[PDB]
Amino acid sequence: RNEGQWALGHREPLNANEELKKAGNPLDVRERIENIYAKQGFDSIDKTDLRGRFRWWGLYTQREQGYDGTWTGDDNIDKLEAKYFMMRVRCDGGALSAAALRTLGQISTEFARDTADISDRQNVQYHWIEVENVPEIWRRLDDVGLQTTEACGDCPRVVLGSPLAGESLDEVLDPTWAIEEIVRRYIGKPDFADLPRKYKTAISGLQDVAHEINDVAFIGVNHPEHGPGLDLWVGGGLSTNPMLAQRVGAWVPLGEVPEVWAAVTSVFRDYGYRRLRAKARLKFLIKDWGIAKFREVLETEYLKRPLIDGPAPEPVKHPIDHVGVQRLKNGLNAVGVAPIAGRVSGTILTAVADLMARAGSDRIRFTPYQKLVILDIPDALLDDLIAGLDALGLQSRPSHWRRNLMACSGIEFCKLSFAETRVRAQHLVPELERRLEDINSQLDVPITVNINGCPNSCARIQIADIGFKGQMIDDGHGGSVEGFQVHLGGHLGLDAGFGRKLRQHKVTSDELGDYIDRVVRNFVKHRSEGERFAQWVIRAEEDDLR
């Protein structure tokens, strides 16, 4: 029925988005940036470059100051669009050298007003960036192996990796090689530069990469016959319409991973919907077809061969965030630290680089939970590193609250937010820490809290014990305020399922601490012994959850 699908011959633009991509490879702008725009400034920029083609280089326009949730909407673009950019650095597998981390630090301090926030896909993002500076940055970034290619846009985003790839005592294998090949073969090249939408990938020999909600995932497992390799998952995403990615039923040896990845991405390009902008993502195609039909098309049209059947690995009970100290195959140590919802700074990143040098380490990783871990810390030097990290506010022994909270960017910089999230979190974690110290003794089990500024679910609303979806609400009728809809009891891993939404429920941004306190105290009262939060949410009365 013409859903825009390329492989049915229905190859015509059905959107303004699908139409600007018809004007040649979007990645071409790079020349127009270095030739034209970086000299004339923001006003020279074509609106189709500005609001579309820029993304293929991780340049997203940032939110003008002073506008609250009232103004958020597709109709107000010109007002909400400031003369500054968010810039997103692509860090496949989170993996950086000390030198690269220092460069990141200096870029931020000098060009981004010292803004630097670790995203929950292992990237850093800068803000307050002016086009004038973008070539200069690209040049320093490239001088340490980093790029912004396809960091935003209708194309493959960062490939996620285990923050302990190659050093974990519990990894089935180290598939870093696959991630590295995928970047080298496919990233930056025409074949996958124009997809139905954004495309998210996760590859790891641990389940530490939130795979269940990626478009495609290769997660380690021991085939009883064939040994260590990767189980293939497909069809994931959480926005307004959440859906768990599902097992293809396949085992893939490490050597064939880049190949198979290409084939899945190729099906997306050729058979993904390109009609409705909010019905374009792979999860939908997978909902319609079913896995059997998809596996068939992958094997017969693209691979020209069967995939080997394989098992699923035992879903983990608790998630793996790698926070704290752990022993490595090196014999050395890894140390994970927890900022508050990814918020650091140029000064801090540079500070960490010097601590790394003092400790003799040249490897650090960003985390899919907005955290960072440093590898190759010998025992002698461990204590000194930990203390230095604390003095910068990066705790290897954080409280539950600081450890387990995530938030998106929110109204501080984002054009689609109704509420403030990243700054709120900076005050909220401490509040919770002291306000519930009272009860901390009892909390043998962690309560994950995710604060999102709108329904897009960037900080993963539906998979938190306490998820918050920012929206506009009303009180006294002479005031519509910023507040949150509440999702309770979401989780991945064993029996992954989304959180339940509450009936007539709005929590104002001032009440977040009150509400969390209330509910968590109710949790420790009406509680079973050894019971997780997501389980107690099945049964307690609806009054106990408000």
The reply on whether position 284 binds ligand SRM by CB under 6 A is no
- Decide if 490 contacts 463 (C-beta within 8 A): yes
Angle subtended by helix axes 98-111 and 134-142, to nearest 10: 170
The single residue listed with the structure tokens 């949730």 is 69
Tell me: does residue 87 bind ligand SF4 (CB under 6 A). no
Number of residues binding to ligand SRM, judged by CB under 6 A: 33
CB 268 within 8 A of CB 284: no
**Does 416 engage in binding with ligand SF4 (CB under 6 A)?**
yes
Closest C-alpha among 387, 373, 384 to residue 325: 373
Q: Does residue 326 bind ligand SF4 (CB under 6 A)?
A: no
Q: How far is the CB of 454 from ligand SF4 (least distance, A)?
A: 3
Q: Residues 9-38: x/- map of binding to ligand SF4 (CB under 6 A)?
A: ------------------------------
- Report whether 261 contacts 216 (CB < 8 A): yes
Count other C-beta atoms under 10 Å from residue 455's C-beta: 16
**What, of ligand SF4, ligand SRM, none, does residue 413 touch, CB below 5 to 8 Å by kind?**
ligand SRM
Question: Closer to ligand SF4 at the Cβ: 101 or 152?
Answer: 152
Inter-CA distances, 514 with 67, 340, 415, 480, Å: 27, 19, 28, 20
The residues in 459-498 that bind ligand SRM, with binding defined as CB under 6 A, are 459-460
Residue 420 is given by DSSP the state: B
- Are the beta carbons of 307 and 252 closer than 8 angstroms? yes
From residue 139 to residue 158, the character string flagging contacts with ligand SRM as x (rule: CB under 6 A) and all else as - is: ------------------xx
Of 235, 369, 220, give the one whose Cα is nearest residue 292.
Answer: 235
Q: Which of 69, 242, 258, 410 binds ligand SF4 (CB under 6 A)?
A: 410
Q: Work out whether 86 is an interface residue with ligand SRM (CB under 6 A).
A: yes
Residue 463 binds which entry of ligand SRM, ligand SF4, none, CB below 5-8 Å type-dependent = none
| Nearer to ligand SF4 (CB atom), residue 257 or residue 425 | 425
- Between 244 and 488, name the residue whose CB sits nearer to ligand SRM: 244
Is residue 9 a contact partner of residue 41, using CB atoms and an 8 Å limit? Answer: no
**Binding to ligand SF4 by residue 456, rule CB under 6 A?**
yes
| Pair 217, 236: CB distance under 8 Å | yes
> Would the annotation count 458 as a binding residue?
yes
Within positions 370 to 409, which residues make up the interface with ligand SF4, using CB under 6 A?
A: 408-409
Contact status, residue 95 vs residue 120, Cβ threshold 8 Å: no
Interaction of residue 453 with ligand SF4, rule CB under 6 A: yes
Task: Identify the helix (H) or strand (E) that includes residue 392.
Answer: none
**Binders of ligand SRM among 396-455, rule CB under 6 A?**
408-409, 413-416
340 binds, among ligand SRM, ligand SF4, none (CB under 5 to 8 A by kind): none
Subset of 163-202 contacting ligand SRM (CB under 6 A): 198, 200
- Does residue 414 have a known ligand-binding role? yes
Half-sphere exposure of 177 (CA within 13 A, CB side): 12
Contact 159, 131 (CB under 8 A): no
Q: What is the 3-state secondary structure (H, E, C) of 3-65?
A: CCCHHHCCCCCCCHHHHHHHHCCHHHHHHHHHHHHHHHCHHHCCHHHHCCHHHHHCEEEEECC
Can you tell me which of 119, 345, 462, 509 binds ligand SRM, judged by CB under 6 A? 119
Taking Cα atoms as reference points, which of 30, 32, 83, 24 lies closest to residue 56? 30
Helices 257-271 & 176-185, crossing angle to 10 degrees? 50
Between 342 and 470, name the residue whose CB sits nearer to ligand SRM: 342
152 annotated ligand binder: no
Annotated binding-site positions for [4Fe-4S] cluster: 408, 414, 454, 458
Annotated binding-site positions for siroheme: 458
* Residue numbers at the binding site for ligand SRM (CB under 6 A): 60, 62, 86, 88, 119-121, 123, 125, 157-158, 198, 200, 210, 213, 237-239, 278, 281, 342, 370, 408-409, 413-416, 456-460
Annotated binding-site positions: 408, 414, 454, 458
* Residue numbers at the binding site for ligand SF4 (CB under 6 A): 408-410, 414, 416-417, 452-454, 456, 458
